[PDB]
Every structure is written in structure tokens, then in C-alpha cells.
Design a protein around this ligand. Sequence first.
Ligand SMILES: [K+]
Ligand SMILES: [K+]
Lengths: 109, 109
Amino acid sequence: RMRMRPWLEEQINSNTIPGLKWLNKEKKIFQIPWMHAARHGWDVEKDAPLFRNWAIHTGKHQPGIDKPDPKTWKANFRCAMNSLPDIEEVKDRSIKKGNNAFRVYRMLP
Amino acid sequence: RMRMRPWLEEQINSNTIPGLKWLNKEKKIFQIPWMHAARHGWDVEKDAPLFRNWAIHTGKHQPGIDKPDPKTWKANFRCAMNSLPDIEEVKDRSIKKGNNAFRVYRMLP
DNA sequence: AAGTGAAAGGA
DNA sequence: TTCACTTTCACT
Ligand SMILES: [K+]
Ligand SMILES: [K+]
């Protein structure tokens, strides 16, 4: 029932997602790990936990019952992020290419 | 105004809606064409006539006056179907994906 | 973009 | 729950 933004803040603040941290907590600028699933070094446990968590949280994935679908978890998460009116991407800082790729977002006050 | 259940029965019986037919008339089980409007092959006259009629019936669309809005017609129809007490969806046969997407419902006795 | 469940929402 | 759907919201 918890909407994406407050849920996301809780995810960042919990430090339980590798790579998910605030770049500037004050201005609410944070970064999300965004490594390509085709790139060597990618691992479901290291790179998709945040996407999986959103899927579990929204009933789209039931651990043990549903077959892991990282591609959909990521696409669903991105689309949901795109639709949020209070969170926008800071593209000049994002680097969604190469190893340890990531995206930077700022939560609108 | 005629309610949705007897209205729907009339539509199915009129044999004027492409694809809208009883799969088992005695048990009141029928199928409604449910092709995704973005899929290639979708045409308003072929895939959205039923949704359009519910829109016209309920004052939500005046041909010639209102600009066609198949997206809303479908959403309105589905939401009205979801609320109906005596009409349930047979999920086990509602092949929603593919070339010929459809939904199966059953009017409860 | 088209689609959806859930739940707030004229006669 | 006035009733029988209808519209808005937040996200395949
Ligand atoms: K956004
Ligand atoms: K129903």
C-alpha cells in the first residue's frame, strides 16, 4: 500500500540495497545502481535486489512461487519511476553505461 | 436505464458485435473480444464496438459530438464489470494475449 | 501509449 | 451501507 516514493526513501535509508545511497541527503539527491544485465559482473543478488523488492512489494513477484524475472522487475521499476511527479532524473550526473553503472535522481520538495 | 447485465445479454443475443458470443448459452458463459488497442490488427469498429455501446448507453459518448475515446470506453466497461455482483470472469480460459485476445465471463444464476 | 485494480467518487 | 456503476490514482 505504501507508494513508491516513501517506499524508496525507506529503501535508501535502510542501506540494504548495494549501491542505493544518497549523494546529498539534504537536497534529496540519490543514486540507483543501474548495471546492464548483459554485462559481465552482473548478478541478480547484487544488481536487482531493489527491482525485486518493488516487485514483491507490489505483488508482482512471490519468492519461490514466481520464476525470477529481473528484466521485468527493472522495466516495471523504471516506468514507475518515470511516472512519479516528485522524483526526476538528473541526467547530467547519471552514467548508465559501463561497469557499476548508475542513475542519479532528485526528490522534488 | 437498462442495467449492465440484461444490457449485455441483449448485446450478445443481437449477434451484431464481432466475437461476442456465448460459449455455453445454457450456463450463460460467454466471451468478449479483448484485443490490446496497441497491437497490430486492432481497429475500433472490430474490437471496440461493445465498449462503445456501453459508453453510448451510459451517456459517456455521443457519436459525432464527442471525439472517440476507445481507451476510456474499455476502462469504464471493465470497471463496471468488476463491480457487477452476478457476472464473474472465468480466468482459466480468458486468453488475454496473442492474435485473438478475449475474456470469458459467466452470468451467475 | 494502452491497460488495470482498488477505492474515492448522478439520480 | 441509497443505488449501480464511474472516475481518479498510481502505477504492461
Ligand atoms: K519521474
Ligand atoms: K464481477
